[PDB]
């Protein structure tokens, strides 16, 4: 529970140091000049408040990354006793920091000369001793153990001896002190290699890269310069161990001296004053050395100094501003800055682990969700189709599993966006049709209640108006008030229910999108930044959660040079806790008091929602004294990734309370893979049947083909040539009507083809017939109309049949194409208002074609690919390392087996990734993971026989 | 033997006539005279795009039972 | 018998009752004390909700114990 | 001399012999008893494996003791 940025005791100490020593003008002589930043005065710009505070922050950081390192399978550097930096306790750490405040408070001048050094450290340890002595009554009982302790740390501040690495405290304070020199010492590449190598001995490589990475952010947060790192830097390499140089002479080779058994031996350190044809060794030469190329991650790498996003002029402007001065003056401010920096550096790497997201808004619906919403609406509209174990619509039976699938795959908030106030209203019709029983999930020794009756009586007693808005609020109320309802609902939605009824499953499937819709409509309150969730969990399960969360925290680190992202990725895919909050309208609160005291929960989920992802909606009134509850349907691409797990107090029942703080991260790497067609296909069958009845009805109602009619009108066309009627009418029947009859006859006689569809279009309009006065033109026209319908019925029939043939093969587009074919009124119009049904189905498919298929591999094909390669090299390296595993005893076999298990899961991660980045239509290529899996098999059996052998030897030794 | 055939008009009336082969066209026009009061002098009879002259018999045109004929009024001429 | 009730506001109200009789009566006592209507208030004890009409004797409520009062209300 | 051979499965087979050299030869004798093949069977006593071709006596192997052999 302890931290620098929160503990007021540490802050008190630092404030003291500022008030009495650090904020006081330099009582020195050389380079004791005061500094002016932005027109505000700071007396110690090199060793002021920002310095010491940053060093305490370094202590926090290095301890954190050390513990992360130990949480990974790593083995940190042991001291005299078996302790590592990752064994530093919060109280010990507090002592270390309180000491660290005064470490530079005993300074007068800036001089570096040894006597001034001893003197200033004398004054420093004295300052510390004074401060401790004064507040002895508060510290000595609980902060410290005894004056022995404070003497230890004071002795560390004194540094009379030149020892720096005897204990954790020593390393932390001294290294934490000197590493702050990165911002001022150049060349950078020289120092950074030195400090890095010095920290790697104790904490490890990755944790060190994390340290210096976050350190850059600490410099940015306190407005000090950020050193660049140039691998091609051609300034002279400064040997930082003492002040010295590396010299190459004659043949472009450095000065060396052979020993006893080195072959070529250690570079000779030539002091910065050398009279030498010989030449100095540059930075890049130093980095390219074979010694520094397998030990230093920065070899070949580059770090852009300054601020990314601005030019060095206005960056310089940022360096010389009021915030620099306030940083060196205001304590609470400096601590806040560093706090936000660090807390940020806990979030950004997680984002780096996964491919980026463009915008925060909710997704758009796909085919399956459109079909889902249509179905749901038809259920709400016609409750007549609801039965005991299935729902029948248009000859299609919909089991329990269908609705469970709907609950599992469909973004129910998105599906909710496609429901309307009519569907909200139809809740009444659903409940009037219903008198079925809903049960508490838990508490089987608890009352059941008829849900339909309850809802109806509730709406009648409260919303007598029938006001639809009030209906929405009432749905949300039913959600947040009555456990007999939301227990069953939230159990069924998350596939962790048992012995539930079909009625209950169905009702849940229907109520989820409606509830989310009601929420989206109702809530006009701004999306909160911090949400809390209470949980009552067994001791062991809580333990498992702590382990998983720790796995996810331990493997994500800020980047310096080497990219440790694919590992963070893999671990987060391996241990993700997000699905505990998904698939349903989760209930949360913005007040901690609710989950901590009232409900007394042993596990608390703290959800940080800064980017306003995770669109939460207010529930209920929200005044002083309310639950301040909010509802969240977790977007499928958003994950709640742990930033920290903390041990807080105990419950009222005694068990320890754990609070895990999560951070919402949106990425297409979180969208689950779902084979489409789970909802849209039965919907297409529904439409196929609905059209089938129409085609049958039309086929039977209307007359079939008589073609004497055609023949007779053609004969009459030839006959009117001798009629005395007109030139116009003769030419009209001969030239215009004649060929139309020709094509109609041809098409009707064989098949169809477009010839039919085109012929029907060739039919002269009623206006054309009207231009022929009034005569026998009418008598020819009614014949022509008889024929027109003769062909109309045929075209509609064939269009329907073709469309239906298209539906069967699931081609949703071709169906539209055919249906387009229907003549519509005029041309056809011999068909009764079952045109309604037809144009309605046309509309259903028009709507189903508005589907937005959302990409699983955005822009970062490169990031996804590179990440996969890194992942599979890492995993294969682990496996092949376990291939040559020497197993001499039983413990080794244990570790080998657990290893084998973890690898087994890693390989499946590899597999899923292979799936989700395969674009196109072909069998997925698994060739690389086949070999891996085979290796897994071999080194599984090997481990098995090794195990039974070793336990044999054990029980043998026992006798 | 005996057979019935149909004559149609642009006006839209259908007349059913009873005839045998070996009746001339002018004879058919006479039967139409009795049927619908149309003078044989103002009648044209058409069958499959062809005009029927008065002198030929039904057999020469291959007119058969249940066939259809098209009658047109050629006024201003005999 | 004496019982204590606490609220999210952080206020603690001290109440005097028998081991018996309704929850709704207890909410009524809270109403008399602090003017809060029984339709808006819910009472919890050790992470568990007390349904109306049951006796404290049923829920095994004892002397000097503490209760947690929350306010729920429909949206409007 | 009397010796016992056991397996983790829990079955006990009782065998008769006196000192012989040759891990193989002992392996040959176990081969005969129950028609079980010894292509690579392991000997542990003292919770330790016995290498090819050194005297049984070494280790103080002795009568009425119990053994556990696994392949």
UniProtKB/Swiss-Prot annotation, chain C:
SS bond list: none
Membrane topology type: Peripheral membrane protein
Superkingdom, natural source: Eukaryota
Site (Essential for function) residue list: 68
Cross-linked sites for Glycyl lysine isopeptide (Lys-Gly) (interchain with G-Cter in ubiquitin): 6, 11, 27, 29, 33, 48, 63
Positions of modified residues (Phosphoserine): 65
Effect noted on mutating residue 65 to D: Phosphomimetic mutant that binds and activates PRKN
Impact upon substituting residue 68 to G: Loss of DTX3L-mediated polyubiquitination of histone H3 and H4
Cross-linked residues, Glycyl lysine isopeptide (Gly-Lys) (interchain with K-? in acceptor proteins): 76
Sites of ADP-ribosylglycine modification: 76
Consequence recorded when altering residue 74 to G: No effect on ADP-ribosylation
Result after altering residue 74 to K: No effect on ADP-ribosylation
Subcellular location(s) per record: Cytoplasm; Nucleus; Mitochondrion outer membrane
Domain Ubiquitin-like residue range list: 1-76
Residues recorded with modification (Microbial infection) ADP-ribosylthreonine: 66
Role this protein plays: Exists either covalently attached to another protein, or free (unanchored). When covalently bound, it is conjugated to target proteins via an isopeptide bond either as a monomer (monoubiquitin), a polymer linked via different Lys residues of the ubiquitin (polyubiquitin chains) or a linear polymer linked via the initiator Met of the ubiquitin (linear polyubiquitin chains).
Name under which the protein is recorded: Ubiquitin
Organism: Homo sapiens (Human)
Organism lineage string: Eukaryota, Metazoa, Chordata, Craniata, Vertebrata
